[PDB]
């Protein structure tokens, strides 16, 4: 059934100019990562080589090589968010979940994003497609509460 979805995706991006990125985006959105089982057909459709595809996949960060937990937590580690106390937040959260930075699981996945546009609302995060700001050491409780 995966092949069907993939074919659909490829058909949807037919004739476009430089359609590798969109196609990969969609492939990821579908499954959750770029399986090596799907490096070839992409190439076959686009006239590329498995290698080029894998290289593109490897370069960019937003293309998962392996799936994530049921929940995902991106936590800015940039300048501004650092300024208004991101370290402490990070510590509290990774103590709560027991998962350090970059370390994933079947349950959750904590990672970094390096900005979100919430540079005034300095301590910022993205939890499961929901943005959060002004993350003091209290809101983390609510963050974890809705998130086991």
Does 131 bind other proteins (CB under 8 A)? Our answer is yes
Does 124 bind ligand FES (CB under 6 A)? Our answer is yes
Which residues face 132 on adjacent strands? 125
Does 129 bind other proteins (CB under 8 A)? Our answer is yes
Closest of 128, 113, 127, 129 to residue 80, by C-alpha: 113
CA angle, residues 87, 89, 94, in degrees to nearest 5: 95
Cα(96)–Cα(1) distance, rounded to whole angstroms?
Answer: 38
Residue 56 touches which member of other proteins, ligand FES, none, C-beta under 5-8 Å by kind = other proteins
Cα(96)–Cα(4) distance, rounded to whole angstroms?
Answer: 41
Using CB under 8 A as the binding rule, the residues of this chain from 33 to 72 that contact other proteins are 46, 48, 52, 55-56, 59-63
**CA 62 to mean position of chain CA atoms:** 5
Which residues face 130 on adjacent strands? 127
| Residue of the chain from 21, 43, 54, 80 that contacts ligand FES (CB under 6 A) | 80
N residues, the chain: 148
Using CB under 8 A as the binding rule, the residues of this chain from 81 to 100 that contact other proteins are 82-84
Q: How many amino acids of this chain bind other proteins (CB under 8 A)?
A: 41
Q: Do residues 89 and 74 touch, judged by C-beta distance below 8 A?
A: no
Q: How many amino acids of this chain bind ligand FES (CB under 6 A)?
A: 11
Does 75 bind ligand FES (CB under 6 A)? Our answer is no
Nearer to other proteins, 5 or 77 (CB): 77
Site of interaction with other proteins (CB under 8 A): 17-22, 24-25, 46, 48, 52, 55-56, 59-63, 77-80, 82-84, 113-122, 124, 129, 131-134
């Amino acid at each position: 059934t995966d092949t069907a979805r993939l074919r659909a995706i490829l058909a949807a991006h037919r004739g476009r100019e430089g359609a590798l990125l969109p196609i990969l985006h969609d492939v990821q959105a579908a499954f959750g990562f770029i399986p090596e089982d799907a490096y070839a057909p992409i190439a076959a459709d686009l006239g590329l080589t498995r290698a080029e595809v894998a290289g593109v996949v490897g370069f960019y960060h937003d293309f998962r090589k392996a799936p994530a937990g049921r929940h995902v937590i991106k936590l800015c580690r940039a300048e501004a968010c650092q300024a208004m106390g991101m370290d402490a937040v990070q510590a509290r959260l990774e103590s709560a979940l027991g998962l350090r930075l970059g370390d994933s699981s079947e349950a959750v996945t904590l990672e970094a994003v390096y900005c979100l546009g919430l540079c005034a609302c300095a301590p910022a995060a993205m939890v499961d497609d929901r943005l959060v700001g002004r993350l003091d050491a209290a809101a983390v409780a609510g963050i974890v509460a809705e998130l086991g």
